[model samples]
Target: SIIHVTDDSFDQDVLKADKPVLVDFWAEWCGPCKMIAPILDEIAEEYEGKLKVAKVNIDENPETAAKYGIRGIPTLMLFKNGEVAATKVGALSKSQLKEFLDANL
Candidate 1:
């Protein structure tokens, strides 16, 4: 399962993580977010020792959402060494998303 990040824990969980982090900015009502869930989960399991896959619900964590200037749901942002290293809007396939992370992480 994807790590569920809240406004209260996002800092410690994402910003302070030891490994590269893939944060999926989403909302419960977003159809595209739902569609990409499995792809992220698979990658999370595959990269268990090297990376992290997490989800931030915009509705529940507006602080983080706003801090990142996340104006769109289902935005995928890759964070490395406590900063954003890569970002992409909209849904991506498993291969595509992996390519994005592979290039950075």
Candidate 2:
């Protein structure tokens, strides 16, 4: 299960977490965003407690998205030690996302 983060909760849920977090910047209006949701669930379970997956709705949580300069839906960002370490835009397959996570860790 992924955690839903808003602009207000971003810091507490993401920045302060002890594990690496994969932030999925998405919007309700985007098909690609929905497409990636299921894969996030998979990753969340696969990683268990070692890492975390978070979702940010760019439609209403614009502040967090702007902070990261996210200009598109389905933007994936990997964070460690309170800072972004890797970023990917557009869509991703399960293997690709896993590969990205592996490379960064």
Candidate 3:
């Protein structure tokens, strides 16, 4: 399962995490964001100890979203050592997401 994130805890939950972090910036009303939920969950389970999967509701956490310059929903960002390493701006298939992560992780 992916962990929910907020502006208050983003630093500790993601930035400070020891493992590579995959953050999904999305909103409740976003269709594409919903479409990627299961894919993200499966990724979270697949890379259990290898990566940290987290989500930030853009509607609820504007600060965190803006901090990352999130211009769209379903923006998946990969962070390693507290820095953004890769980003995808749309809903991607499981295989595509796996490839994205594999290349980064």
Candidate 4:
């Protein structure tokens, strides 16, 4: 499972990370967010130690969501060295997700 992140933990888990971090901004009521959950889980496991995967519930953590200017559910932000590398919005297939990671990695 991807690590659950919140406004309190965002700085520790993402901003100050030693490695690349992938943050999935989602909501419980979002169907596409649910669709991408398992893909993120697989990525988390496959890239263990190489990357960090975290999920932020927009509804539960509005401050962090607003901080990132998250306008859509299932937005995936890739961060490296305390900076945002790239961001993708909407659901994606496992292959597409892997492609995104590979390109960034």
Candidate 5:
């Protein structure tokens, strides 16, 4: 399952993870965020041993959002060795998402 990380735990949980990580920056009111929730969860479960997939709610975790320069909802960023490898903004189909993760991983 995808961990629900907070502003305080963002660094250690996602950025500093041992494996490549996908952090979905979202908020409660974001329709697109909701749309991609299952994809995140599924990927989290499927990629459990190979990668880290997690969500950071923007509304409650503003610090992490500002640090990452997240200017929009549903901004998915790939982090490798604690740094951003790439980013994709908005919702995506399952196949599209797999490609994104494959490229980063």
Candidate 6:
């Protein structure tokens, strides 16, 4: 359901994706980041063909992180047609996650 996107592959895998993308700009060992990890898994499967969920490890891939101006961990960004549609920071509830994706998608 989730794919790890790196610096060189981010544009093609995410910005150029056919489906709308949900980008999780996170790092390992982050408290809230891990909290939302499970929720994103469900979101990726439940959303199915409608959405493509991707994660970027800021520690390993700094390009995408800096490009997006990710100042915090667990920053969620919804992208459509190669542009950012919406963004949220920090951990969110499962229902809230659905609402966030629903409103954008």
Model 1, global lDDT:
0.90
Q: Model 6: clashing residue pairs?
A: none
Model 2 misplacement above 4 A = none
What local lDDT score does residue 20 receive in model 4, on the 0 to 100 scale? 93
Runs of candidate 6 with Cα error greater than 4 angstroms are none
| Best first by TM-score, ranked | 6, 3, 2, 1, 4, 5
- The Cα error of candidate 1 at residue 38, in Å, is 0.6
Predicted candidate 1 versus true structure: per-residue lDDT over 33-89, tens digit per residue:
999998888999999888988899999888998899999878999999889999999
Candidate 2 lands at a TM-score of 0.95
Model 3: clashing residue pairs? none
TM-score of each: 0.95, 0.95, 0.96, 0.95, 0.94, 0.96
Count clashing pairs, candidate 6.
0
lDDT of the candidates, in the order given: 0.90, 0.90, 0.91, 0.90, 0.88, 0.91
**Model 4 lowest lDDT segment of ten:** 1-10
Residue 54, candidate 5: alpha-carbon lDDT: 81
Angstrom error of the Cα, residue 22, model 3: value is: 0.4
Please provide, for model 3 over 31-96, each residue's C-alpha lDDT reduced to its tens digit, 9 standing for 90 to 100. 999999988989999998889899999989989888889988789999999999999999999999
Model 3 weakest 10-residue run by lDDT: 65-74
Off by over 4 Å in 5: none
Residue-wise C-alpha lDDT for candidate 4, range 29-59, written one tens digit per residue: 8999998888888889999878999888999
